[PDB]
Design a protein around this ligand. Structure first.
Ligand SMILES: Cc1cc2nc3c(=O)[nH]c(=O)nc-3n(C[C@H](O)[C@H](O)[C@H](O)COP(=O)(O)OP(=O)(O)OC[C@H]3O[C@@H](n4cnc5c(N)ncnc54)[C@H](O)[C@@H]3O)c2cc1C
Ligand SMILES: Cc1cc2nc3c(=O)[nH]c(=O)nc-3n(C[C@H](O)[C@H](O)[C@H](O)COP(=O)(O)OP(=O)(O)OC[C@H]3O[C@@H](n4cnc5c(N)ncnc54)[C@H](O)[C@@H]3O)c2cc1C
Lengths: 472, 482
């Protein structure tokens, strides 16, 4: 009863489920092992999918309940939130896509093994089911796609009741009266804004001086924070949390101080969301016994084919270095297995976009101004505001700008940074541009349809290339 | 103000470039010509700048499409399915029209401010070319102003094409202009022509509560060059929304009746099956055509083509070499971004630059919900050119952003060259088509392959992943998620 495979994938998130599918499409006898009830990993079950659903639903709530719909002649006397039903739309979307992956596995003849996978030899993986039953897979290659987990806050114990991670925050049973968020990174700002739109009094506390996490352009970050403050989202930047006490009355007392030191203070809230980071997950996988050592941050070191020290054991996604993003994991999955089959293996982390699905959105790809200064690159800047864009103006949705960074000597686009409507979709045109080594002039000369938000991308590139846009 | 020459301002002007018309082609050409260091004049006959597009075209239409879509989401099922519960969703049409008007006004004022900032001299009057190097503007007060100029750029745009025997009065018989400003939602509307303008304006009124039928002489919706499979799928979706179609049908006449309603007589296009349909508002949108009235063309010897366009060469020169023409008044797709691009490169050409534009990289968009957008070649075009191609498709129903948003109609279709994998056409029916097609336009500019695009790290979850998936299916034979 051992299964014989060519490729055994441990984990079914964006890295592993896509790697399983592609490996099957390339002709490899393929197994995928998953410990959880459903397939899809962090992204589908407790990440990107439920968060974007709540961002969409909460945005439309705000449009209806606030001023926006009345200003377009859509009149309603009495707009009410039904939170159970909003959660149910979220849950339905999750269920359909997790079902979708099960179908795709059958369609592609990927064998799904349920259980906790442990590498029990160079060419062997053992999955242990919840009742203790085992299934052994003897296998040519092993692909580790075990992903990430929440980074705990030392001294504060998450219980998913009143002190929640992202997981708990995606499923609160009612709108909290007061919420504090620790970490103003991408996840914190998205979940904070959801709850703020729905009625919560929300403050994010962040040790650093800016919101939106690592690599966000500083000017874009400042402009983004100012807009969110005007919506009602409060921030205490440059601020340390010392501790948090669960109280007898169900509330929480949170002690903070300036990050440099000084001014202690206590803030009370009904829910504390702890989202200071995420970290690679390799627990009880069998690495120590194989001699595969981790790097100081818990990642598995790999070569450019994604091979560990043991050349038939591979790793991809949130368990390895680079941006902890679902598209990044997916592409590492694809190219790893293409490599197994003898092909070239390339991904360029500089061409991997980041998106924040707030309203307004934020999105960027390539280098920020700060990165270009660190590196000593000589660059120029083009900017165009959405207030001068015809589609944004027609939609009455005009916050933000596109900022382009270009190289003086060659006019090469080095980075694209977008704050405003449609940023998430627009950054894909920018990623193609960076992949192709576009000049700012090339982008300015594309015949962008009129009226589109994309025209602002064209115009900011014109400003960088020629010195001046047309419409501003 | 030397920069505004209205009634009363009639001294002779000297210019390097005189642009006749302030639509997307003309106003942008003026701005760019000034930025290149030419002494530039733009002449406009109407009370506001920005032409057809700003005043009676793209801008007000897009505003009503956006607002009417939201009304649909609120008033039907969508908002309730997200737990957003509302008592009594009511249409305030005056207030919706007012949002539209506000946007138009801010953008027309925007162009006036840009002309100032760039030192473009705005002459308010009817321009007529009165010599190889001369334009005379006649103003509203009867006065005249001579511009002695080295180059002339004709950007006089287009007008609605009339329907013989049906008089547009902008009351119950409207053009696109009248349809953009109706006082009330008609109980029933007939639309003559199922081109882009017709389906957009139909759909607006359908959403707002009208019963709508479009009558079209050809066998498909969405105008010339739309891919036939995309057209059929789109038509089907619009039928399920409640928008009726009579294709392969000609209108033989219309009569305004004593009850205020209109009887529209129709037949099969080939003949027979005579029939009458009745409506409260009749929208006539069979086409648009180039506008060159009283421009001085005959006197100069500039002969028009049989469709009324001004023939020009690859630098946009007419047969008189210092007289140029761009935009809706020349050949090619009658589109704002097309006009604007011709304008820019024409004036770069006057300054000594290269003049290049690849029409196979010019997208078209329909701003319905779902949107339709495309660029490059359709299947029908590739067949008739004898090009060997392969197809990749990916449905929005398998895309995570579309699914999460419960916004899943349509697909992306990519056509790639059977041997080289070169992208030859991209055709998108669904949410976000208008924005997404610009990624495809950029790809086509480079001569990119299906593989090239499949390997771009599109962000997750985005609609654009469907674009990547369809390219992957075209390149490798199979996508990941379908
Ligand atoms: C709240 C939130 C929102 C997010 N939003 C976005 C977004 O909008 N865009 C974006 O790009 N990214 C987003 N992310 C990040 C994204 O979820 C991750 O980058 C992505 O899931 C990583 O994919 P992966 O395949 O490497 O690992 P994961 O998705 O973490 O999957 C790892 C899988 O392996 C399983 N597993 C682990 N060990 C074993 C074992 N020994 N045996 C069996 N199974 C095992 C796990 O149970 C899990 O299913 C978000 C994350 C969170 C928490
Ligand atoms: C309802 C509607 C919806 C549309 N939607 C879209 C869309 O979504 N996207 C898109 O790309 N296109 C759209 N279009 C088409 C678009 O409006 C045109 O292709 C575009 O305006 C053409 O630009 P132009 O500069 O060539 O001419 P025009 O915009 O027609 O401008 C010509 C200008 O010249 C002026 N003029 C003419 N003759 C003279 C003279 N002798 N002296 C002085 N002034 C003169 C006119 O008054 C006018 O202001 C739409 C059109 C309509 C009617």
């Amino acid at each position: 009863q051992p299964i014989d495979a060519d490729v055994t994938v441990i984990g079914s998130g964006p890295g592993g489920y896509v790697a399983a599918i592609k490996a099957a499409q390339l002709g490899f006898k393929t197994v995928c092992i998953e410990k959880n009830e459903t397939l899809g990993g962090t992204c589908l079950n407790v990440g990107c999918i439920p968060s974007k659903a709540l961002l969409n639903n909460s945005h439309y709530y705000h449009m209806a309940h606030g001023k926006d719909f009345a200003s377009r002649g859509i009149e309603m006397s009495e707009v009410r939130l039904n939170l159970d039903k909003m959660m149910e739309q979220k849950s339905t979307a999750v269920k359909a896509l997790t079902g979708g992956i099960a179908h795709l596995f059958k369609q592609n003849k990927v064998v799904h093994v349920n259980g906790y996978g442990k590498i029990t030899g160079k060419n062997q993986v053992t999955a242990t089911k919840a009742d203790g039953g085992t299934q052994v897979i003897d296998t040519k290659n092993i692909l580790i796609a075990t992903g990430s987990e929440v980074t705990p806050f030392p001294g504060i114990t998450i219980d998913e009741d009143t002190i929640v991670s992202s997981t708990g925050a995606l499923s609160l049973k009612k709108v909290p009266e007061k919420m504090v968020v620790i970490g103003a990174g991408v996840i914190g700002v998205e979940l904070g804004s959801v709850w703020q739109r729905l009625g919560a009094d929300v403050t994010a506390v962040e040790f650093l001086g800016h919101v939106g996490g690592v690599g966000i352009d500083m000017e874009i970050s400042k402009n983004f924070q100012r807009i969110l403050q005007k919506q009602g989202f409060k921030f205490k930047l440059n601020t340390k949390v010392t501790g948090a006490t669960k109280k007898s009355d169900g509330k929480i007392d949170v002690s903070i101080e300036a990050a440099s030191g000084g001014k202690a203070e206590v803030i009370t809230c009904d829910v504390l969301l702890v989202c200071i980071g995420r970290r690679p997950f390799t627990k009880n996988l069998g690495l120590e016994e194989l001699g595969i050592e981790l790097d100081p941050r818990g990642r598995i070191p790999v070569n450019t084919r994604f091979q560990t020290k043991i050349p038939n054991i591979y790793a991809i996604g949130d368990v390895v270095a680079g941006p902890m993003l679902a598209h990044k994991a997916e592409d590492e999955g694809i190219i790893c297995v293409e490599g197994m089959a003898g092909g070239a293996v390339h991904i360029d982390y500089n061409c991997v976009p980041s998106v924040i699905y707030t309203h307004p959105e934020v999105a960027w790809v390539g280098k920020s101004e700060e990165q270009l200064k660190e590196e000593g690159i000589e660059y120029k800047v083009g900017k165009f505001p959405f207030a001068a864009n015809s589609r944004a103006k027609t939609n009455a949705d005009t916050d933000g700008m596109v900022k382009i960074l270009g190289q003086k000597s060659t006019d090469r686009v080095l980075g694209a940074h977008i704050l405003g409507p449609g940023a998430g979709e627009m950054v894909n045109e920018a990623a193609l541009a960076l992949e192709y080594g576009a000049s700012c002039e090339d982008i300015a000369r594309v015949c962008h349809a009129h009226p589109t938000l994309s025209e602002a991308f064209g115009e900011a590139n014109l400003a960088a290339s020629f010195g001046k846009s047309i419409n501003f």
